[PDB]
Amino acid sequence: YPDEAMLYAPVEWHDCSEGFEDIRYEKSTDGIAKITINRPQVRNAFRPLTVKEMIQALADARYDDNIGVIILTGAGDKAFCSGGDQHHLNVLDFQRQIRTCPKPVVAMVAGYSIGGGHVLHMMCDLTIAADNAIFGQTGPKVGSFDGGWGASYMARIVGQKKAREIWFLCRQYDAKQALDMGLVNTVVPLADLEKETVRWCREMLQNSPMALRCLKAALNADCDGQAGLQELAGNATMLFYMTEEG
Amino acid sequence: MIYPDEAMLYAPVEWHDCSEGFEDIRYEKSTDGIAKITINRPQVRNAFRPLTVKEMIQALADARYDDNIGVIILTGAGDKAFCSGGDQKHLNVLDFQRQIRTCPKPVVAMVAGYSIGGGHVLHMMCDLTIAADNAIFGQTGPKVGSFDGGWGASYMARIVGQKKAREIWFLCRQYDAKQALDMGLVNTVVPLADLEKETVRWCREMLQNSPMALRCLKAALNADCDGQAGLQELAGNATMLFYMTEEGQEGRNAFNQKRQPDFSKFKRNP
Amino acid sequence: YPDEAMLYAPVEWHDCSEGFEDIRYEKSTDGIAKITINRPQVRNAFRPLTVKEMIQALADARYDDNIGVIILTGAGDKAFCSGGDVHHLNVLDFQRQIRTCPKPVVAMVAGYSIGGGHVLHMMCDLTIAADNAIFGQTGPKVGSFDGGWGASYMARIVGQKKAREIWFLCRQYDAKQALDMGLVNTVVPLADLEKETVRWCREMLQNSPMALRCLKAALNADCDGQAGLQELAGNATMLFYMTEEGQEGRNARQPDFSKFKRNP
Amino acid sequence: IYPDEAMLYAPVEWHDCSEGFEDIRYEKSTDGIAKITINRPQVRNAFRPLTVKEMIQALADARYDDNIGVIILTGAGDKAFCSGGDVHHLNVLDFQRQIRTCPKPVVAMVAGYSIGGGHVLHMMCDLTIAADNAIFGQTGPKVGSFDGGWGASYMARIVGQKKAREIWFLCRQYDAKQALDMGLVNTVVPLADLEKETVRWCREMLQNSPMALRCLKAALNADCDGQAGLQELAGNATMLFYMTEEGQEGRNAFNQKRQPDFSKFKRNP
Amino acid sequence: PDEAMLYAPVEWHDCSEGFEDIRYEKSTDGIAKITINRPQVRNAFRPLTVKEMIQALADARYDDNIGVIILTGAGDKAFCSGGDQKVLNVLDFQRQIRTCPKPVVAMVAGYSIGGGHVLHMMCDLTIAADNAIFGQTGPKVGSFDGGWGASYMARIVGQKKAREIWFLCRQYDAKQALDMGLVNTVVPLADLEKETVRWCREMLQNSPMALRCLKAALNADCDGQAGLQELAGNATMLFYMTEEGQEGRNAFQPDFSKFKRNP
Amino acid sequence: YPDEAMLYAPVEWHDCSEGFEDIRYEKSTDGIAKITINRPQVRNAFRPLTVKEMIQALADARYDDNIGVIILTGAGDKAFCSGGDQHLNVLDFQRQIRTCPKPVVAMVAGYSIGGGHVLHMMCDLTIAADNAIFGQTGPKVGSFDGGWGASYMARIVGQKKAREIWFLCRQYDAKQALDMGLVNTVVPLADLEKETVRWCREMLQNSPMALRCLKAALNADCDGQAGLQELAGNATMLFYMTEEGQEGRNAFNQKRQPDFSKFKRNP
């Protein structure tokens, strides 16, 4: 395993936010890309423009051979993303893009991850929660619902009883509650959120990118039927090209 | 995000009896929209016989069709048993399972004491389960010459995961309220004396939310399990919603106005 | 195999229609129940009352131990069911009821099977079509859709390309076209329609009702996820009750399964 | 009330939108058909990564053009629709997903060869109109490749498992009549009438409810694509919900800092 | 490709030592042939027969010189009339055919009935003689196959035809089978093996790894996680054949820093 | 319920290892077969031979009508199995565990790692000692199990935990495994076999037929048509044991038309 010294080393961030109004986008030299929703004034809720930019940034990250892991997070300590405002439903494109991204996407959550913003963290492969993080859906209370990955995939995370509770009542849940039901991967003190997140990112960066790619697709394949097969078979095709028989 | 005040949530509940004709169950309705179906055979720990199931089906259909009802509670009479299983002394409980599954309103298992065997599958079928601290859970099939290999198995695995589902079925042990909570088999555990109080609160929290959103989400979550049957529910709600829009009304309007439908006038979205 | 003489024997229908406004309900002595949409003045389109009645009639046939097969059909020779005319969308209840009926259900189709009425014939296990039969959807032409079994299950019948064509264009298809894409099981001259349908019913009636029941559930199981497992496993449970091992557990004192073999 | 032969077969006024594209042509008709044409007849319309990038760009434009209701995918000339692959090496997988999730009917108009990667492309299209000189088949196992995604599973949902295994394992070529008989294409027409017939089919769809077509396409995908299909279908449901008074009461209440009153709305059976 | 190659004579070698109920042969060009040899009972299988077929198929799977397997019946009157009623390991045989990483071809002359019909369906391809007869018998003789015999049949012929075949238990001739997509082709009885060998050789000309991956992928549309196990297993195998995958065993701390992180 | 005294009675293991080199194989009188990987020197990693022998032993247990439950374990107290020895016949063994009609219990002491971790997951139940360690290693050593090692892992611990396990390849102690539902129970190392045997005896007291139908039904939630083959296969077996099923057999045997008209048509 990597040593705590390298895992907890300072990070060399370079800004790549040119042209974005709603988000910051940064890359570290050791292979991490970070997308930060930058609207703390509205608790980092997204509007169609925000989504358009996030899609832009993620495509760039996917296409950058130096980038191995992506972080999705919100500006400040009070919110990851408090929901959608509140082309229209372009966040559905973003969900699919996170899903099919052949690199791990890690949600770094401080404060509220709510509504459309809660589905976004669920869509990420992993979630690192600050001890101040708050989670929940709001659909039925505000005249919406996410019945796609927001529902079924939530069930594959926390189980059907809990998923029905989360959606039907629309309560809020603190970090411990989220951890207890398997909704997040770990809870760390707010001060160490990014520190610990970078560590998790670095642990993955030390591993085979091809293996990670294949495993993400295999795990998607337990959910996404033929769409999941397209991903998994796609990687097999890519591997076949790299061999002699190929 | 304004939530309901606790004063409202914990206000007294008024049940009105609608049990006329039932022998094995009680059926009651609150004026604020909860329907409560109670297995009423406390002397046999609320075990169900075919008659009990017929009556619960009848009551659940009523609750479904009553536009004043938004949520249903399923429970057992007394403090000792939600339902101890099938009366051992035909298999129409399979129909009741489907009926709970496809009910467009949330169904809540309110569990005191034993939820066992067929009665355990019943609480699992309900969307949520509120358990009293004296609640006991488990299957009995392999110990009594039976099994539920339908939703009793697969769906249980979607609740507690595959390792725990195999343990529950293979050994047929009993589990206390803390055990069930820990594995995610129930949603919360509350003091026995507060069982109905907290259950009603949960119901009222749902009653404040969109009925349409709730039926859509219920269908969507069933859709993760029930293949094309799930698609039928989810798509049927989509159809219902479509009928509530101008485009979804043009066909009926055209027919009424004796003209061909015209979809040229509607905007295409991305 | 059964003798053609017996298969094509005359059939004597007994009326059980008492109390129905929109349908006829009849039973044969040899175990066929026939449900007939009786609204020729509207090409046998169904309204919510029609559906409630068909649900009632099908529930009766399910519980009648004398009935082994159900026929669904439309009155007259011009329409099986032309479409929709408890509650507004109760046809969804009826679809599920046909699906989970442990007895084979056969659509007997003369003339139009269209829209909601086309999904109905698809739901039936088999379809015997008259040479004048006409099939198709109408949803997108009249601002509606059936995205449930009306879409996915159709695709399991005719394949994805054909399913998309049927729904997206909403054309009508003759009996030959329907047969060519596997949408119906056979096409017979209009005069022979009930004759050939009764033969098919009698062929199934000669077979094991338990085997048919299990196979219907098994075939549904390829489509309906856990709902399908509920049906298939439920039949397994019923079978288990009929065995000595099942009955021992139920008689047991601590049960004693030791006297039972742990087969491979 | 049906189309009308005169309208269906009327002339089509195409407008060029190919500015900037190297490998494809892109055109739109005034009545709502967008046509993406692979423009590489010199190599039997095989695609290279740039070709795929451009098709992605064009398809996204059509998706977002509220004037467009149907998309035609085709190859330049009469000899090939697409003969396979040679911006990254496997970006055709992106294009596959984009056709899949496009809320508008996509029609493959096939003249001549639809082979290999190009065969999977026509399969992904909702419908396929084939000219009588059309030839279909896979080549992977012969050329050190395979499409085990929708190229396999989805093919089986079209032609059945026996035929799908045959097509892939032997890599033969099939003529239009063979393809028609196995359910692989929707119709076969004379080469000279290919666009004429295709446009008719497009026009027949253009007469229908765009929302209904959208929901049905997602419903049909949903029989194949698991949760990804649920995402499409449920997404359409959410979109419709926003258009209802009940949905709107939820939004209004939240924006006015008040509890919503959904009680004014029935709890249907 | 090349008619003279495809229809060239076939050189068979016997490998039947020890078998009572079957013959097992291997050609010099990489085809294995398992022949049910009980023509006096229309090639119905008894438990012994299934045991031997499992043995033979396991051998064929593990023989690197074999690229395609033919399953057939002795004589011209019967592929397999089903389970010997005079007497359930056939479920093991089904799984083995399913998970065989090489194409399995059913060469059908005469009856393929009941259990014997499920067998041809399980094979990847079916070449039928014009004298072939297909159908199920379960509901007529107190049985059913509700596993691959039901669901997978539906993935071949569609749900209407599947329900008809099972519910009525009629027999279907070669043209009927072809018309519903139940078999891949129908040929004159005298040319059955000739054409079957051609199809086999056409497959033998293609990549065995690609065929293996495609079979798993097509199974994966049906077999849930069991299908994923097959498909992902092939991907794991392919991975081992790459530099990145080798960086493990070549080390035996591994260093993946060098490898691109592709889109 | 079974008596505590009976459940905790001493075990009488009878050896059946004859002809094996990498494993021990033993049967108890009361119906438990135990397969032990016997390569303590290499933390009980498997080589192709080990797998071939485990396949042989598992097949024997399946066919032995005296056996109702199988235990899979590793020699000593330091490792259950640390994975592949540094083929893919282990894939056949996974399927063999999956389709075994008898419950299979992983009795885990110390390391269950890599290929050895998938093996415990494949078992119906896992009894873990307080010294057990779990984790995958694929991405760290240039491999992956994208089959049941992935999808089925998600059906146990949920999708978030499954991705964490695979992507980082950390090690997890027994408490962590329990909390995530990866194992069924954790017991003091000293009582590992005592407790494992109790769980086995608890199962042995139950209907073998009900157990195999339920194992198939639970597999069926994961394995599509392959799972339908298992579940339906059991239904057919049950059917054969009924008068109705048997009539069809007799009728065909006695060269006469079957008469099913004498059997009830249930709702």
Give the whole-angstrom CA distance, residue E145 versus residue E166: 9
Residue E226 at interface with chain A, using a CB cutoff of 8 Å: no
Give the whole-angstrom CA distance, residue A218 versus residue A222: 7
Residue with tokens 């890690």: A106
Tell me yes or no: is domain B1-207 CATH 1.20.1240.10: no
Coil, strand or helix: which one is D181?
helix
Residue with tokens 């046998």: C44
**CA distances (Å), origin C259, targets A24, C242, D123, F65:** 71, 17, 57, 11
Four-way CATH pick for E1-204: 3.40.228.10, 3.40.50.1100, 3.40.50.150, 3.90.226.10: 3.90.226.10
Neighbours of A33 (CB within 10 A): 25
Give the whole-angstrom CA distance, residue C246 versus residue C238: 10
C19 Ramachandran zone, left/alpha/beta (phi>0; psi -120 to 50): left
Residue A8 labeled ligand binder: no
Residues D92 and D48 sit within 8 Å (Cβ to Cβ): no
CA nearest to D128, candidates E222, C145, C159: C159
Give the whole-angstrom CA distance, residue B127 versus residue A164: 6
Residue F17 labeled ligand binder: no
Task: Give first-to-last CA distance, chain F, whole Å.
Answer: 34
The pairing of strands B107-111 and B128-132 is: parallel
Residues F130 and F186 sit within 8 Å (Cβ to Cβ): yes
Cβ–Cβ of D204/C158 closer than 8 Å?
no
Which chain F residues are within 8 Å of C249, Cβ to Cβ? 207, 210
Q: How far is CA D20 from the centre of its chain?
A: 23
Which chain F residues are within 8 Å of E237, Cβ to Cβ? 88
Buried b (16+ CB within 10 A) or exposed e, B221-244: bbbbbbbbbbbbbbbbbbbbbbbb
Class (C level, CATH) for E205-251: mainly alpha
Please, which residues have CB within 8 angstroms of residue A172's CB and are 6 or more apart in sequence? Answer: A114, A134, A135, A136
Give the whole-angstrom CA distance, residue B201 versus residue B54: 29
Residue F56 at interface with chain E, using a CB cutoff of 8 Å: no
The C-alpha of F191 sits at a distance from chain C's nearest C-alpha, in angstroms, of: 27
**CA distances (Å), origin B155, targets A224, B121, D133:** 19, 9, 52
Name beta bridge partners: A130: A188
- H or E stretch at F69: strand F69-74
Residue E167 at interface with chain C, using a CB cutoff of 8 Å: yes
F209, amino acid identity: M
Give the whole-angstrom CA distance, residue D3 versus residue C59: 42
D75, amino acid identity: G
Class (C level, CATH) for D1-206: alpha beta
| Closest by Cβ to E181, choosing from D88, D169, D182 | D182
Four-way CATH pick for F205-255: 3.40.50.410, 3.40.50.620, 1.10.12.10, 1.10.530.10: 1.10.12.10
Give the whole-angstrom CA distance, residue E213 versus residue E232: 9
Please, which residues have CB within 8 angstroms of residue D255's CB and are 6 or more apart in sequence? Answer: none
Cβ–Cβ of C236/B147 closer than 8 Å?
yes
Residue E228 token pair: 């994923």
Cβ–Cβ of C96/B229 closer than 8 Å?
yes
E207 → chain D, closest CA residue: D141
Coil, strand or helix: which one is E66?
coil
Give the whole-angstrom CA distance, residue B25 versus residue B201: 23
Classified by CATH at the fold level, domain A9-205 comes out as 2-enoyl-CoA Hydratase; Chain A, domain 1 (3.90.226)
| Closest by Cβ to A218, choosing from F150, F169, F180 | F150
| Closest by Cβ to B106, choosing from A139, A168, A171 | A168
The C-alpha of F163 sits at a distance from chain A's nearest C-alpha, in angstroms, of: 6
Please, which residues have CB within 8 angstroms of residue C156's CB and are 6 or more apart in sequence? Answer: C222, C223, D223, E154, E158, E159
Please, which residues have CB within 8 angstroms of residue E190's CB and are 6 or more apart in sequence? Answer: none
B172 Ramachandran zone, left/alpha/beta (phi>0; psi -120 to 50): left
Q: CA quadruple E72, E78, E83, E85: dihedral positive or negative?
A: negative
Classified by CATH at the fold level, domain B208-258 comes out as Lyase 2-enoyl-coa Hydratase; Chain  A, domain 2 (1.10.12)
**CA distances (Å), origin D59, targets A55, A241, B61, B214, D75:** 17, 28, 48, 35, 15
Total CB pairs under 8 A between chain E and F: 143
Buried b (16+ CB within 10 A) or exposed e, D152-168: bbbbbbbbbbbbbbbbb
CA dihedral B136→B141→B144→B145, nearest 10 degrees, is 170
Strand order of the β-sheet with B128-132 is: B15-17, B25-30, B34-39, B71-76, B107-111, B128-132, B188-190
CA angle F223-E102-E98, nearest 5°?
Answer: 25
Classified by CATH at the fold level, domain C1-205 comes out as 2-enoyl-CoA Hydratase; Chain A, domain 1 (3.90.226)
Coil, strand or helix: which one is F247?
helix
Residue A113 labeled ligand binder: yes
Task: Give me the long-range contacts of E189-195 (CB less than 8 A, separation at least 24).
Answer: E189/E76, E189/E109, E189/E129, E189/E130, E189/E131, E192/E107, E192/E109, E192/E127, E192/E129, E193/E10, E193/E107, E194/E7, E195/E127
Helix pair angle (B211-223, A160-169), 10° resolution: 160
Residue A60 token pair: 């760039």
Coil, strand or helix: which one is A19?
coil
Please, which residues have CB within 8 angstroms of residue B256's CB and are 6 or more apart in sequence? Answer: none
Give the whole-angstrom CA distance, residue F76 versus residue B226: 45
Give the whole-angstrom CA distance, residue B111 versus residue B102: 21
Give the whole-angstrom CA distance, residue A50 versus residue A74: 12
Neighbours of C207 (CB within 10 A): 26
| Closest by Cβ to E150, choosing from C156, C206, C219 | C219
**CA distances (Å), origin B227, targets B220, D229, F220:** 11, 11, 13
CA nearest to D62, candidates D74, D54, D70: D70
Give the whole-angstrom CA distance, residue E212 versus residue E210: 5
Give the whole-angstrom CA distance, residue A173 versus residue A186: 15
Cβ–Cβ of A152/B221 closer than 8 Å?
yes
Q: CA quadruple B106, B180, F212, F153: dihedral positive or negative?
A: positive
CA-derived radius of gyration, chain D: 21
Neighbours of C261 (CB within 10 A): 11
| Closest by Cβ to D145, choosing from E210, E218, E220 | E210
Residues 6-35 of chain F with CB under 8 A from chain B are none
Residue C110 token pair: 């003369």
Q: Write down how long chain F is.
A: 267
Give the whole-angstrom CA distance, residue A69 versus residue A207: 11
Q: Is E257 exposed, middle or buried (0-12, 13-18, 19+ CB in 10 A)?
A: exposed
What is the second-level CATH architecture of the domain D207-257? Answer: Orthogonal Bundle (1.10)
For every residue of chain B, DSSP letters joined together read --PPPHHHHTSPP-EEE--TT-SSEEEEEETTSEEEEEE--GGGTT-B-HHHHHHHHHHHHHHHH-TT--EEEEEESSSSEEE--B-----THHHHHHHHHH-SS-EEEEE-SEEETHHHHHHHHSSEEEEETT-EEE--HHHHT----STTTHHHHHHH-HHHHHHHHHH---EEHHHHHHHTSSSEEE-GGGHHHHHHHHHHHHHTS-HHHHHHHHHHHHHTTSHHHHHHHHHHHHHHHHTTSSTTTHHHHHHHTTS----TTSPPP-
**CA distances (Å), origin E25, targets D72, E56, E103, E237:** 52, 9, 16, 29
| Closest by Cβ to D205, choosing from C88, C155, C169 | C169
B65 Ramachandran zone, left/alpha/beta (phi>0; psi -120 to 50): alpha
Cβ–Cβ of C157/E160 closer than 8 Å?
yes
For every residue of E157-209, DSSP letters joined together read H-HHHHHHHHHH---EEHHHHHHTTSSSEEE-GGGHHHHHHHHHHHHHTS-HH
Fold agreement (C1-205, C206-252): no
Q: Where are the domains of chain A?
A: 9-205, 206-246
Give the whole-angstrom CA distance, residue B249 versus residue B244: 7
Give the whole-angstrom CA distance, residue E174 versus residue E187: 9
For every residue of D101-142, DSSP letters joined together read H-SS-EEEEE-SEEETHHHHHHHHSSEEEEETT-EEE--GGG
CA nearest to C58, candidates C116, C109, C7, C107: C107
Residue F62 labeled ligand binder: no
Helical ranges in chain D per DSSP H: 5-8, 49-64, 92-101, 117-124, 153-159, 161-170, 176-181, 194-206, 210-222, 226-242, 245-255
Residues F118 and F94 sit within 8 Å (Cβ to Cβ): yes
Cβ–Cβ of A102/E207 closer than 8 Å?
no
DSSP state letter for F11 = P
Please, which residues have CB within 8 angstroms of residue A187's CB and are 6 or more apart in sequence? Answer: A129, A130, A131, A133, A175, A176, A178, A179
Residues C196 and E168 sit within 8 Å (Cβ to Cβ): no
Residue E75 token pair: 């004589």
Cβ–Cβ of B149/C237 closer than 8 Å?
yes
CA angle A180-A185-A188, nearest 5°?
Answer: 90
Classified by CATH at the fold level, domain C206-252 comes out as Lyase 2-enoyl-coa Hydratase; Chain  A, domain 2 (1.10.12)
Residue D95 token pair: 């294009």
Give the whole-angstrom CA distance, residue D222 versus residue A226: 10
Residue D101 token pair: 């999730």
Q: Which resolution in angstroms does this entry have? A: 1.9
Give the whole-angstrom CA distance, residue E252 versus residue B201: 61
Question: Neighbouring chains of F at 3+ CB pairs within 8 Å?
Answer: A, B, C, E
Q: How was this structure determined?
A: X-ray
Class (C level, CATH) for A206-246: mainly alpha
DSSP state letter for C191 = G
**CA distances (Å), origin D143, targets C252, D170, D266:** 66, 12, 61
Interface test with A, best of E230, E261, E262 (most A CBs within 10 A): E261
Which chain B residues are within 8 Å of F202, Cβ to Cβ? 171-173
C86 → chain D, closest CA residue: D269
Helical ranges in F124-223 per DSSP H: 138-141, 151-157, 159-168, 174-179, 192-204, 208-220
